Ligand binder design. Structure first.
Ligand SMILES: NC(=O)C1=CN([C@@H]2O[C@H](COP(=O)(O)OP(=O)(O)OC[C@H]3O[C@@H](n4cnc5c(N)ncnc54)[C@H](OP(=O)(O)O)[C@@H]3O)[C@@H](O)[C@H]2O)C=CC1
Ligand SMILES: NC(=O)C1=CN([C@@H]2O[C@H](COP(=O)(O)OP(=O)(O)OC[C@H]3O[C@@H](n4cnc5c(N)ncnc54)[C@H](OP(=O)(O)O)[C@@H]3O)[C@@H](O)[C@H]2O)C=CC1
Ligand SMILES: Cc1cc(Cc2ccc(O)cc2)n(O)c(=O)c1
Lengths: 358, 367
């Protein structure tokens, strides 16, 4: 068995929780040993501990550099009645992301028989009661000049206004994180309010020509945008990853939520078909990054090999129902076209046993 | 021939000009008489009269309530070279949309082989450390209220200001409420007023205030409604959002009376450079067509014109069923079979397809 190493892991809620534990038992644990830092971010325990588990996991990823997350219920009032929650806890994803910072990257996992691009996305509001000038001024620390611009002269009635700012560090971190991400994937990077979006274009060209393999970098405009490049700005085949600026810290996760409807059938006793692929690839991306930080040739191999098996299994006709309805059309799907949740996991395990045996 | 009424019409540029005249000669004029208020918004005539023609149309739509516009070249430096323009004239749409006001509505046209969305700046660069503030100074010399946008203490960056008046927000409501009632469709407003508690909050409220004071009645009167949402949770309805040869843009004035319609695609220059060269083209008229039927059907409503209203409805159907039965342009055939696999016997060119819509409009109307 591979010594993978130190990996933070957060468990979730409902249907993705069922799949999380399956992934560990049929795909991960049987081939890899981890010095595992589990945190139980299920809604019940988050409530029980006063969203404390959530803070504890986040600091761990800050400490051990690698996190993989199971999808988690975010509370609104309907949930608060359901779990009798003592408060309406903020999303753990929000909680975690502030503590760690960085930029998210959503990659669709591409299968060859279904209908890659990595997109990475990146204030003072008030009420103007009645008429009057609303201006925005800038006064440098060395008291040399006062530059004041007029946002609008309210002559009509009143209304609403707002202010928005931005420091260089934040944009430099968009750049670093985006250029670094381009080399890890070996893909070209593209970057898509005359003077606002302009300041973005520059710091990119400046970090590019200062630190940053048969690769390059370019700029564009929204509407101007074969497939296989990094772009800076079924669901169960989406994989978002939060990349911290330093380049060391990484958190991986499914891009879908907890699939409650499938879980409600699971409870009722009915047969389901939840796509594990998103949650799966959350693990392999985190494991492969662990491998990078540790120069772990054995592990790195395993990570890629499991990403392989997953794609080859669907490419071979064995798949779940969300994928079978994407190929054939929902109303035209027969039961012998897809596998259920527990059978598709069996096939991957069987193909992972064989693929890894050779 | 049906008595249509008072309708402003503006001719456009390049390929949309070719298709436009095909629409009038082969689909509209042969069945409908209009008191026609043509204005020629071609880049030349706009140049020649000093974009005057453009202003004349706006006040014309402002007067007669119903307008249909053909896609029109917007000048950039390159265009000024081609035509030797005397100036780089503002978009005709920019001009016209200022004079009339209202809210644009883009509706995607569904072929079986719909959502109506209607959407709603001062930026500068912060060189080095220092405070950027945004202030409010009332007209009645009362206190001046100062908010701090941010104190940059390390280095620089960027900042910006953004506004919105109530008149602006109140006109968003109506234009969105009118369009929902015209369509017998439910209305949803997607704000982001969790983050922006005081900004979009003003949006969310002014919407719930208009709903009651005037529109809760008539909404139940068509078993329809209105609700508010937040962007990601919103993920046959009218969608208001605080922010291709089958796309149809329509400007709804708040009053409910004035309406200007047009295809959402541009002048299709590439196909036109082929047209000039003498080569065979294949451009989609449905959008340009549907502009007419939205403006004609709006005309019919204001005037109790069952004859016109049917005809409008009848033509829109002809367009959709003509494609739903397999006769289409190349952009649509490339949607079905994939771009690299498109054979010529899959699609019709511009002049064969207009023929087919015309033929089908003869038989349909015969019934
Ligand atoms: N912490 C996190 O990472 C996130 C958490 N959430 C949470 O999800 C909870 C409710 O789930 P909800 O947002 O409504 O539903 P989902 O976000 O999980 O996805 C909605 C629909 O997409 C389909 N879907 C998504 N993933 C899969 C999959 N692996 N296999 C098959 N189908 C899939 C299902 O379609 P179908 O109808 O066919 O069954 C599902 O009903 C919320 O309480 C919210 O807090 C939301 C977003 C991310
Ligand atoms: N005043 C107005 O109403 C508007 C004016 N414009 C002006 O149009 C001019 C040029 O527009 P441009 O952006 O280049 O072209 P378009 O915006 O119209 O679209 C360009 C391409 O999109 C495809 N396309 C769009 N509509 C159709 C259609 N009906 N049938 C088939 N294909 C279509 C074509 O691709 P393909 O080549 O592969 O076939 C076409 O070459 C500009 O100067 C611009 O200012 C732009 C928007 C509205
Ligand atoms: C100049 C201009 C153009 C459009 C339409 C448009 C279409 C395609 C495109 O790529 C960009 C603009 N409108 O609506 C305006 O008010 C003003």
């Amino acid at each position: 068995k591979i010594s993978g190493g130190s990996v933070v892991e957060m468990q979730g809620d409902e249907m993705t929780r069922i799949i999380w534990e399956l992934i560990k038992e049929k795909l991960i644990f049987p081939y890899v040993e981890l010095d595992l830092h589990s945190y139980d971010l299920g809604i019940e325990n988050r409530d029980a501990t006063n969203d404390q588990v959530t803070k504890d996991a986040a600091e761990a990823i800050k400490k051990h550099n690698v996190g993989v997350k199971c999808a988690t219920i975010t509370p609104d009032e309907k949930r608060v009645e359901e779990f009798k929650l003592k408060q309406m806890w903020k999303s753990p994803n929000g909680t975690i992301r502030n503590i760690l910072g960085g930029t998210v990257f959503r990659e669709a996992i591409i299968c060859k028989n279904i209908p890659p691009i990595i997109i990475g996305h990146h204030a003072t509001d008030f009420v103007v009661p009645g008429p009057g000038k609303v201006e925005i001024t800038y006064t440098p620390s060395d008291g040399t000049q006062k530059v004041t611009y007029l946002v609008h002269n309210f002559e009509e009635g009143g209304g609403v206004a707002m202010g928005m700012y931005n420091q260089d560090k934040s944009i430099e971190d968009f750049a670093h994180s985006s250029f670094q991400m381009a080399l890890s994937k070996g893909w070209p990077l593209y970057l898509s309010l005359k003077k606002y979006d302009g300041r973005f274009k520059d710091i990119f060209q400046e970090i590019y020509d200062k630190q940053y393999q048969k690769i390059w970098y370019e700029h564009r405009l929204i509407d101007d945008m074969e497939g296989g490049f990094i772009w800076a700005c079924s669901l169960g085949m989406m994989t978002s990853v939060l990349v911290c600026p330093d380049g060391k810290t990484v958190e991986a996760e499914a891009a879908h939520g907890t699939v409650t409807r499938h879980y409600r059938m699971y409870q009722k006793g009915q047969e389901t078909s939840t796509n594990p692929i998103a949650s799966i690839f959350a693990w392999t991306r985190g494991l492969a990054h662990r491998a990078k930080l540790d120069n772990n040739k054995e592990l790195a191999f395993f990570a890629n090999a499991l990403e392989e098996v997953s794609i080859e299994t669907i490419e071979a006709g064995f798949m779940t129902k969300d994928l079978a309805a994407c190929i054939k059309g929902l109303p035209n799907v027969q039961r012998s076209d897809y596998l259920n949740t527990f059978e598709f996991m069996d096939k991957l395990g069987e193909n992972l046993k064989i693929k890894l045996a050779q």
